[PDB]
Structure formats: C-alpha cells, structure tokens
Amino acid sequence: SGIDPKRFGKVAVLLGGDSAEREVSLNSGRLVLQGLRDAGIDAHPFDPAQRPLAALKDEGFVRAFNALHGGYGENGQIQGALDFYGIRYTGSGVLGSALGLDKFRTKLVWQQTGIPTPPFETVMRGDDYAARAQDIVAKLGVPLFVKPASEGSSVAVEKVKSADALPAALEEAAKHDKIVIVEKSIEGGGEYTACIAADLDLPLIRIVPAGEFYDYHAKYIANDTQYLIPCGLDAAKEAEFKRIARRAFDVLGCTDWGRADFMLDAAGNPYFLEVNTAPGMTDHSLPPKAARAVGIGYSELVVKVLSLTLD
Ligand SMILES: Nc1ncnc2c1ncn2[C@@H]1O[C@H](COP(=O)(O)O)[C@@H](O)[C@H]1O
Ligand SMILES: [Mg+2]
C-alpha cells in the first residue's frame, strides 16, 4: 500500500463550517486538500456552511476527509448526515463522535471498562451547591477541576484550590451546563497525549504548559507551551500508555483517528481526561508532528487516514 489513488474516487475535504473553530478548520482543510492532491487523489474543498450538503451525493463524491472542528463537525451531526447521504468519512461515527464530546458519559464508560480516569463527582443545576461542595471535598480533597460534562458550555475549566471556593465554582458552572464534572486534580507528574492514526506507531507527546495547567492561554495565546517528543517516559511505560490509549478510544466507539489525553500522577499512574475525535491538521498541529517523528510525512499521514474509509 501502495494504494492506487484512483481507488479513492472523488473526495471532498470538509472545511470551514459555522463553528467558533472555523479558522483552524480552514487552515487544516487547505493543508489536507494539498496533502491529498500531492498524492494524486481527486480531492476538492467542500465547505458545508456555503454549499448545500446534498451536493456531496448529487455531485458524486464517494468519501470525505473531515477537517471540521467544533459544533456539527465534531459532535455526530454531520457524521449522521453523511451516513444518511451514503458518503464515507474519516474519523468516528455518530456514537463515537457524540460520546467523545460528553465527558460525563465517557468517564462512566471508562470506569466500567477499567480505563483509568480521575475520580469524580457530579453536580446538577438546582443542587445545594454548598452542601455538594462539602461532600465532594470530603471525598476527593483539593485541588479539584470543575468542568462541563457535556458539549458545548461557555464556562472554561476551573482549578479550585480551596474548599471555600468550591460552591461559587459549582454554581457558575451549573449556570451553563445542566451537568458539572468535579475531578480530583492529578498532581505530581506530567501531561501527555497519544495520537492515533490507523495502526501507525506514533509516539506520545508530553505537553508542558508554562502556567498552572493546559488552559486557553497555554493552548492559544502563550508562545512557550512545549510539545515534547521524546515524551521522557521509559520505553515500557510509553508502550503501555499507548495501548491503554487505544483501548480508551475503542471502548467509546471511536475509530482510530484522534488523540487520547491523559495525566500522570507522582507515582506514574495514568488518568485519561478525554478523547479528541477531530484533531488539528495545521502545520503546527500534533498529529503531523507525531507522524514526522516516525518518518511519516504530512501527505502520507492524510492518505493513511483516508485509506481507512476504503473497504
Ligand atoms: N483532573 C485533572 N487533573 C489535572 N489536570 C487537569 C484535570 N482536568 C483537566 N486538567 C487540566 O486542564 C486541562 C483542560 O481540561 P480539559 O479540557 O477537561 O481536559 C487539561 O488539559 C489539563 O491541563
Ligand atoms: Mg475542540
């Protein structure tokens, strides 16, 4: 393989959209289109915000590389519509896509299938926030991470360092998601991500934020968040975590395009935070880095991802 690019037929690269991440998507999608055309594949841009989606079927596209991020592009909406119209697509199906955006149900699944994840409690809108805060501190201690359960709240993740500050953080979070996750903070180790692309053996990435945690500032503002390969871990642990990461993805119904995000504690135990079924494909994005670390260039990576829509 050695795939005749003819075998891919007429291919759409879905890019743009209407979400808050239209920008990263335009960037990723134009690169992906080039990567596929560099391989001689009959690929075309298709922006579903600006083109009628039925044209995919009507113009005879057979498959799509999904370079959308956020809203309908990532949550199962456009995956369902594509299944409905008979168009094959990269990444996960409806269930994996929707379950991967729902941290509450992701973490339940993981707990029942032995995928490690930070101990947690939930808080619902209309709860007695002061009373829940007491019970939660008593169980989990401080610090804690307070996060929306579900897609796509407007209240950023908050690290709560003191018991007295918990009730306000709960009440605010619950104003914007009916379900709030409250996680034990995993301290004393480091942060990592496992990119998954087919059966490619991709290295782990250590993520080193310059401040408290991988916050909006660290991801989108800061010039100095580190994304490190080698990740620092010993070979047996790195292999072990990559294996767990792939099971974490599989048990949610996700198929093998994405990244699995995890923390390590001081003892070196892992705790998975989320999967991401729509990772970036810009020139500074993590899957191309991890792939180039093992000798797989950008066009080769996009062809490998697309190849799984065959058969
Ligand atoms: N339970 C946790 N323990 C430690 N760090 C966390 C935890 N939850 C979230 N974080 C941090 O906050 C970031 C954003 O959280 P989230 O999008 O939920 O993953 C993560 O990438 C970590 O840097
Ligand atoms: Mg996102």
- DSSP codes joined into one string, 240-289: HHHHHHHHHHHTTT--SEEEEEEEE-TT--EEEEEEESS---STT-HHHH
Shared domain check, 196 and 76: no
- Structure-solving method: X-ray
Shared domain check, 85 and 7: yes
Shared domain check, 198 and 263: yes
Q: Which atom of ligand 1 is nearest to the CA of 191?
A: 23
Active-site residue numbers? Answer: 21, 153, 220, 259, 261, 274, 276, 280
Residue 4 to residue 92: CA distance in whole angstroms? 24
- Paired tokens of 69: 């991020």
If DSSP codes are grouped into helix, strand and coil, which group holds residue 89? strand
Residue 258 to residue 256: CA distance in whole angstroms? 6
**What is the distance, to the nearest Å, from the Cα of residue 47 to the centroid of all Cα atoms in its chain?**
21
Q: Which ligand is nearest to the CA of 210?
A: 1
Instruction: List alpha helices for the chain, DSSP H.
Output: 22-38, 55-58, 77-84, 94-100, 103-113, 129-140, 166-176, 216, 235-250, 286-293, 298-307
Q: What is the DSSP letter of 204?
A: P
Paired with 262 in beta bridges are: 192, 272
Q: Which atom of ligand 1 is nearest to the CA of 120?
A: 1
Residue 295 to residue 6: CA distance in whole angstroms? 25
Exposure class string for 70-103: b at 16+ Cβ within 10 A, else e: bbbbbbbebbebbeeeebbbbbbbbebbbbbbbb
Resolution for this PDB entry, in angstroms: 1.5
Edge-to-edge strands of the sheet including 88-89? Answer: 42-46, 10-14, 63-66, 88-89
Residue 144: CB within 6 Å of ligand 1?
no
In angstroms, what is the C-alpha Rg of the chain? 20
Residue 9 to residue 40: CA distance in whole angstroms? 11
If DSSP codes are grouped into helix, strand and coil, which group holds residue 18? coil
Shared domain check, 239 and 135: no
Give distance in angstroms: CA of 261 to centre of ligand 1: 9
| Largest separation between any pair of C-alpha atoms in the chain | 63
Domain span at 285: 91-116+187-311
Residue 30 to residue 37: CA distance in whole angstroms? 11
Number of domains present in the structure of the chain: 3
Mutate to test the pocket of ligand 1, among 145, 151, 159, 186 (most ligand atoms within 8 A of CB): 145
Shared domain check, 304 and 232: yes
Give distance in angstroms: CA of 101 to centre of ligand 2: 9
